[PDB]
Coordinates of C-alpha atoms and ligand atoms in Angstrom, one line a residue:
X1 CA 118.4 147.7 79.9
X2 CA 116.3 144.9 80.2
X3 CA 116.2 141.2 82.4
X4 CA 116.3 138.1 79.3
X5 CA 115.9 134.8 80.0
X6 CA 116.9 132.0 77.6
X7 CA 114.6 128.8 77.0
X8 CA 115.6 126.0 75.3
X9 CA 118.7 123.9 74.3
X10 CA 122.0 124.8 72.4
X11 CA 120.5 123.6 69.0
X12 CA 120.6 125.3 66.0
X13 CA 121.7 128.8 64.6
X14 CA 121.1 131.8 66.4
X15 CA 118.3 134.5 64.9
X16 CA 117.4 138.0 66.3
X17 CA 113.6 138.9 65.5
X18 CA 113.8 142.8 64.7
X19 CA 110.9 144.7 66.0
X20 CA 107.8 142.8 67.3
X21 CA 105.3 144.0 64.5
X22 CA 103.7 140.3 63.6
X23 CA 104.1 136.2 64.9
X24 CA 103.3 133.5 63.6
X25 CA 105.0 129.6 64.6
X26 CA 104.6 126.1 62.9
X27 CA 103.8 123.8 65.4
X28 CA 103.0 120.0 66.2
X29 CA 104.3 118.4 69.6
X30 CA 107.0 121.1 69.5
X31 CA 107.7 124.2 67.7
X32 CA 108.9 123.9 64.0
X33 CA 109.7 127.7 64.0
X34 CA 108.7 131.0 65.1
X35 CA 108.1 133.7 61.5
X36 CA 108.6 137.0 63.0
X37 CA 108.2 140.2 60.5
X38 CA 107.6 137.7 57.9
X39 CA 111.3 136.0 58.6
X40 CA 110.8 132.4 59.0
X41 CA 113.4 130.7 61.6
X42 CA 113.2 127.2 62.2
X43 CA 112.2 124.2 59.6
X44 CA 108.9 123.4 57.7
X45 CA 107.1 120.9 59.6
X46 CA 104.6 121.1 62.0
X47 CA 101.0 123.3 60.7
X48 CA 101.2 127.0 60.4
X49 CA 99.3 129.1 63.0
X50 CA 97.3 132.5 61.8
X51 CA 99.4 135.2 62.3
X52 CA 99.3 137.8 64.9
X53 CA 99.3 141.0 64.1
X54 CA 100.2 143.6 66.4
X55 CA 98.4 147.2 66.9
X56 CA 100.0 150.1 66.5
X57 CA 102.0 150.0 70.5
X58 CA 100.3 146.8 71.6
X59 CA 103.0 144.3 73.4
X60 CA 103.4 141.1 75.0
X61 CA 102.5 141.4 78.4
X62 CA 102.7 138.0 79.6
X63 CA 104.4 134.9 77.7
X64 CA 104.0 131.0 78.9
X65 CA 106.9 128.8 77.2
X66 CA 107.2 125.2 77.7
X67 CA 110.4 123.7 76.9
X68 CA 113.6 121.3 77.3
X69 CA 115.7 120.9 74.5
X70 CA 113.3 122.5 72.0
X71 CA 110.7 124.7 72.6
X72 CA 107.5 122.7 73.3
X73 CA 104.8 125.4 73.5
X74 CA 104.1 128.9 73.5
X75 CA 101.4 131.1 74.4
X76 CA 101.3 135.3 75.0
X77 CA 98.7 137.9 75.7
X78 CA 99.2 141.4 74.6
X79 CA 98.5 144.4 76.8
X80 CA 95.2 144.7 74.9
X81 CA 94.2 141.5 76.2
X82 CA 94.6 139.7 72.6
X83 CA 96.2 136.3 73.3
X84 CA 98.1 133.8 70.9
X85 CA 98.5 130.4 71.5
X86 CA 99.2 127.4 72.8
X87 CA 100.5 126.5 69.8
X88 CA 103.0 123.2 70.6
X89 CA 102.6 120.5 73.0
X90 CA 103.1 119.4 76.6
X91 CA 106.2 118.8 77.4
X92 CA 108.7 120.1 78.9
X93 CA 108.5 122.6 82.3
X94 CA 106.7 125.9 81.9
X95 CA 107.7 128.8 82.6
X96 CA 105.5 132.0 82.3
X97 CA 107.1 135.7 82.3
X98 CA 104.0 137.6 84.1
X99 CA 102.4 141.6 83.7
X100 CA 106.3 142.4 81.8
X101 CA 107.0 143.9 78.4
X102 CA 108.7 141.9 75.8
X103 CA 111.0 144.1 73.4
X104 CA 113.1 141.5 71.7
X105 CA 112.3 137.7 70.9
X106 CA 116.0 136.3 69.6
X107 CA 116.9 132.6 69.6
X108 CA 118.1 130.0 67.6
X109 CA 116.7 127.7 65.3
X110 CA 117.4 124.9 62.3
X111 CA 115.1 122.1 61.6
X112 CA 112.9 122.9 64.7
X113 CA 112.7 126.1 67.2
X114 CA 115.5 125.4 69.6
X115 CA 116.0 128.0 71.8
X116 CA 114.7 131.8 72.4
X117 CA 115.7 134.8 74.1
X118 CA 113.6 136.4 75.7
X119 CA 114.5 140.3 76.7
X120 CA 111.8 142.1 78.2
X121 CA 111.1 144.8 80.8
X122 CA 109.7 143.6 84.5
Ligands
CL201 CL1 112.1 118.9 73.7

C-alpha cells in the first residue's frame, strides 16, 4: 502493499488502530485524539464527536487532514457516501487523499493527536 503518508509532527507515542470498524475523535482547534475500535489515543480535552460506525465492507474513500505539528482537522467520506467530519480547526495546510482506500489509520499521540499514518490503496 500500500502508498502511506504521514501527517503531523514527531509528538507523542506511536499507536496502530487495528481494523477500521468504528471512529470517533475529541476535538477543539486541534485534535485531542482519534478512539478507533473503542481505543482511545490522544488526551481528554477537546468535545467528543458521535461515533462512526462502519457497515459491514464500507471504507474511507476519500480523507481531508489539516495539520502542522498536530493534527488540526479531519474529515472522510466512505465509499457509501457517509461522511465524518470536520471535526478540528483551521490551521495548518490540507491535504486530501482522493477516490483511495484506507486500510490502516496508525499514528502517534499523548496529550493531543500528533501525528497519523495513513496507509491506503490508490
Ligand atoms: Cl498544530
Amino acid at each position: 502493499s500500500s502508498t502511506h503518508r504521514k501527517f503531523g509532527g514527531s509528538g507523542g507515542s506511536p499507536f496502530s488502530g487495528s481494523g477500521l470498524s468504528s471512529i470517533a475523535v475529541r476535538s477543539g482547534s486541534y485534535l485531542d485524539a482519534i478512539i478507533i475500535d473503542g481505543v482511545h489515543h490522544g488526551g481528554s480535552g477537546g468535545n467528543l464527536s458521535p461515533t462512526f460506525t462502519f457497515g459491514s465492507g464500507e471504507y474511507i474513500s476519500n480523507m481531508t487532514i489539516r495539520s502542522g505539528d498536530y493534527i488540526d482537522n479531519i474529515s472522510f467520506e466512505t465509499n457509501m457516501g457517509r461522511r465524518f467530519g470536520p471535526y478540528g480547526g483551521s490551521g495548518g495546510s490540507a491535504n486530501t487523499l482522493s477516490n483511495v482506500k484506507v486500510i490502516q489509520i496508525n499514528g502517534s499521540a499523548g496529550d493531543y493527536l500528533d501525528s497519523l499514518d495513513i496507509y491506503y490503496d490508490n
